[PDB]
Design an enzyme around this catalytic site. Structure first.
Site, PDB file in Angstrom:
ATOM      1  N   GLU A  56       0.849  -1.180   0.000  1.00 13.38           N
ATOM      2  CA  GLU A  56       0.000   0.000   0.000  1.00 13.38           C
ATOM      3  C   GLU A  56       0.895   1.243   0.000  1.00 13.38           C
ATOM      4  O   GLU A  56       2.002   1.244   0.555  1.00 13.38           O
ATOM      5  CB  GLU A  56      -0.974  -0.031   1.193  1.00 13.38           C
ATOM      6  CG  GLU A  56      -1.741   1.271   1.382  1.00 13.38           C
ATOM      7  CD  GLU A  56      -2.769   1.386   0.264  1.00 13.38           C
ATOM      8  OE1 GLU A  56      -2.495   2.116  -0.708  1.00 13.38           O
ATOM      9  OE2 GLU A  56      -3.804   0.688   0.301  1.00 13.38           O
ATOM     10  N   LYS A  83     -14.898  -6.758   3.301  1.00 16.22           N
ATOM     11  CA  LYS A  83     -13.623  -6.899   2.610  1.00 16.22           C
ATOM     12  C   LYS A  83     -13.436  -8.312   2.093  1.00 16.22           C
ATOM     13  O   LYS A  83     -12.876  -8.507   1.018  1.00 16.22           O
ATOM     14  CB  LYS A  83     -12.450  -6.494   3.497  1.00 16.22           C
ATOM     15  CG  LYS A  83     -12.139  -5.025   3.332  1.00 16.22           C
ATOM     16  CD  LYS A  83     -10.769  -4.670   3.783  1.00 16.22           C
ATOM     17  CE  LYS A  83     -10.501  -3.212   3.514  1.00 16.22           C
ATOM     18  NZ  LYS A  83     -10.617  -2.851   2.102  1.00 16.22           N
ATOM     19  N   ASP A 129      -2.235  -5.023   0.942  1.00 19.42           N
ATOM     20  CA  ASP A 129      -1.500  -3.978   1.642  1.00 19.42           C
ATOM     21  C   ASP A 129      -0.076  -4.343   2.052  1.00 19.42           C
ATOM     22  O   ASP A 129       0.812  -3.491   2.042  1.00 19.42           O
ATOM     23  CB  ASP A 129      -2.270  -3.586   2.893  1.00 19.42           C
ATOM     24  CG  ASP A 129      -3.553  -2.874   2.570  1.00 19.42           C
ATOM     25  OD1 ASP A 129      -3.524  -2.009   1.675  1.00 19.42           O
ATOM     26  OD2 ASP A 129      -4.581  -3.208   3.189  1.00 19.42           O
TER      27      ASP A 129
HETATM   28  O1  LIG Z   1      -1.661   3.739  -2.939  1.00 17.58           O
HETATM   29  C1  LIG Z   1      -1.612   4.262  -4.056  1.00 17.58           C
HETATM   30  N1  LIG Z   1      -0.684   5.235  -4.334  1.00 17.58           N
HETATM   31  C2  LIG Z   1      -0.625   5.844  -5.569  1.00 17.58           C
HETATM   32  C3  LIG Z   1       0.447   6.882  -5.869  1.00 17.58           C
HETATM   33  C4  LIG Z   1       1.548   7.015  -5.023  1.00 17.58           C
HETATM   34  C5  LIG Z   1       2.555   7.937  -5.304  1.00 17.58           C
HETATM   35  C6  LIG Z   1       2.480   8.713  -6.459  1.00 17.58           C
HETATM   36  C7  LIG Z   1       1.397   8.572  -7.322  1.00 17.58           C
HETATM   37  C8  LIG Z   1       0.390   7.651  -7.032  1.00 17.58           C
HETATM   38  C9  LIG Z   1      -1.498   5.441  -6.577  1.00 17.58           C
HETATM   39  C10 LIG Z   1      -2.432   4.467  -6.306  1.00 17.58           C
HETATM   40  C11 LIG Z   1      -2.497   3.879  -5.058  1.00 17.58           C
HETATM   41  O2  LIG Z   1      -3.460   2.883  -4.789  1.00 17.58           O
HETATM   42  O1  LIG Z   2      -4.798   4.116  -1.874  1.00 15.91           O
HETATM   43  C1  LIG Z   2      -5.891   3.785  -2.299  1.00 15.91           C
HETATM   44  N1  LIG Z   2      -6.934   4.687  -2.294  1.00 15.91           N
HETATM   45  C2  LIG Z   2      -8.155   4.291  -2.782  1.00 15.91           C
HETATM   46  C3  LIG Z   2      -9.336   5.238  -2.813  1.00 15.91           C
HETATM   47  C4  LIG Z   2      -9.136   6.615  -2.868  1.00 15.91           C
HETATM   48  C5  LIG Z   2     -10.230   7.477  -2.904  1.00 15.91           C
HETATM   49  C6  LIG Z   2     -11.522   6.959  -2.889  1.00 15.91           C
HETATM   50  C7  LIG Z   2     -11.725   5.583  -2.842  1.00 15.91           C
HETATM   51  C8  LIG Z   2     -10.632   4.724  -2.807  1.00 15.91           C
HETATM   52  C9  LIG Z   2      -8.331   2.999  -3.271  1.00 15.91           C
HETATM   53  C10 LIG Z   2      -7.293   2.104  -3.274  1.00 15.91           C
HETATM   54  C11 LIG Z   2      -6.075   2.493  -2.791  1.00 15.91           C
HETATM   55  O2  LIG Z   2      -5.013   1.570  -2.788  1.00 15.91           O
HETATM   56  O1  LIG Z   3      -8.332  -0.860   3.064  1.00 12.43           O
HETATM   57  C1  LIG Z   3      -8.130   0.121   2.366  1.00 12.43           C
HETATM   58  N1  LIG Z   3      -8.947   1.196   2.484  1.00 12.43           N
HETATM   59  C2  LIG Z   3      -8.740   2.311   1.720  1.00 12.43           C
HETATM   60  C3  LIG Z   3      -9.678   3.475   1.940  1.00 12.43           C
HETATM   61  C4  LIG Z   3     -10.084   3.751   3.248  1.00 12.43           C
HETATM   62  C5  LIG Z   3     -10.944   4.808   3.490  1.00 12.43           C
HETATM   63  C6  LIG Z   3     -11.388   5.588   2.424  1.00 12.43           C
HETATM   64  C7  LIG Z   3     -10.985   5.318   1.122  1.00 12.43           C
HETATM   65  C8  LIG Z   3     -10.127   4.255   0.875  1.00 12.43           C
HETATM   66  C9  LIG Z   3      -7.683   2.364   0.811  1.00 12.43           C
HETATM   67  C10 LIG Z   3      -6.859   1.269   0.682  1.00 12.43           C
HETATM   68  C11 LIG Z   3      -7.081   0.158   1.446  1.00 12.43           C
HETATM   69  O2  LIG Z   3      -6.254  -0.957   1.329  1.00 12.43           O
HETATM   70 MN   LIG Z   4      -6.443  -2.092   3.229  1.00 13.90          MN
HETATM   71 MN   LIG Z   5      -4.664  -1.217   0.002  1.00 12.86          MN
HETATM   72 MN   LIG Z   6      -3.373   2.374  -2.702  1.00 12.90          MN
END
Ligand SMILES: O=C1N=C(c2ccccc2)CC=C1O
Ligand SMILES: O=C1N=C(c2ccccc2)CC=C1O
Ligand SMILES: O=C1N=C(c2ccccc2)CC=C1O
Ligand SMILES: [Mn+2]
Ligand SMILES: [Mn+2]
Ligand SMILES: [Mn+2]
Length: 200
Positions: A85, A139, A113
């Site tokens: 992650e 999940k 993660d």
């Molecule tokens: O955890 C994330 N981080 C991202 C990231 C991190 C560093 C720079 C640009 C994108 C992209 C997508 C994700 O799920």
């Molecule tokens: O870093 C993350 N953020 C997520 C995200 C961000 C904004 C709204 C919903 C999910 C999804 C998956 C990830 O690994």
């Molecule tokens: O468990 C996760 N929850 C995420 C999250 C949590 C709160 C709001 C949006 C995305 C991002 C990435 C994960 O692995």
């Molecule tokens: Mn998670």
């Molecule tokens: Mn994740």
């Molecule tokens: Mn992510």
């Protein structure tokens, strides 16, 4: 008391590395941290839990898992966990494929993660303001990898993990729960908590 902004809270209570990674992640999935501010705090919190989960855990010269809380780990030590992650999608899958080709562990459908080199499995970390069993089932239904281990934390100290296998010692998990408690308390002192809890 006066209602603070969640933005101010996040910037003041989380390490800038974490805040920066969370902003880049939200940007990538098209959500704005200045609007989805509760989500912003939830994402910083989840990231911080992922880091804390791996902190201090190493594999020693004999291959046994150990805990090293000093600033200087012995140089022959290997980190016990791979952190997936917080990496952009390209680097995250690059790390996953590497692990899979190296260890033989099957490849997951969704980015997990962490990877545990001791237990030889990927981990999905969950952090919830709701009841842990509910969040756990959501999940499990999402990923259904069934090799990926799930570990859920709540802000009130409850945990739920796959097969009642909690991976880490009580002390490590207590550090995490204590951090979540502090986050909740600080949000509450700024009158941010009720809105944060209900927004999940
Ligand atoms: O955890 C994330 N981080 C991202 C990231 C991190 C560093 C720079 C640009 C994108 C992209 C997508 C994700 O799920
Ligand atoms: O870093 C993350 N953020 C997520 C995200 C961000 C904004 C709204 C919903 C999910 C999804 C998956 C990830 O690994
Ligand atoms: O468990 C996760 N929850 C995420 C999250 C949590 C709160 C709001 C949006 C995305 C991002 C990435 C994960 O692995
Ligand atoms: Mn998670
Ligand atoms: Mn994740
Ligand atoms: Mn992510």
């Amino acid at each position: 008391g006066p209602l603070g902004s969640m933005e101010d809270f996040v910037r003041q209570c989380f390490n800038p590395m974490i805040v920066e990674l969370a902003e880049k992640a939200m940007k990538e999935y098209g959500e704005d941290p200045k609007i989805e501010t509760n989500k912003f705090a939830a994402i910083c919190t989840h990231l911080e839990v992922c880091f804390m989960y791996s902190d201090f855990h190493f594999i020693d010269e004999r291959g046994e898992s150990i805990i090293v809380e000093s600033g200087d780990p012995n140089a022959l030590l290997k980190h016990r966990f791979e952190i997936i992650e917080g990496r952009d999608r390209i680097m995250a899958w690059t790390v996953v494929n590497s692990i899979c080709n190296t260890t033989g562990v099957e490849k997951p459908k969704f980015l997990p993660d962490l990877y545990d080199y001791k237990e030889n499995r990927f981990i999905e970390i969950g952090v919830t303001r709701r009841e842990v069993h509910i969040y756990y089932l959501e999940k499990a239904n999402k990923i259904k990898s069934e090799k990926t281990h799930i570990h859920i934390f709540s802000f009130t100290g409850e945990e739920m993990a796959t097969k009642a296998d909690y991976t880490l010692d009580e002390e490590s998990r207590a550090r995490i729960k204590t951090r979540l408690f502090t986050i909740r308390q600080e949000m509450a002192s700024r009158s941010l908590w009720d809105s944060f809890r209900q927004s999940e």
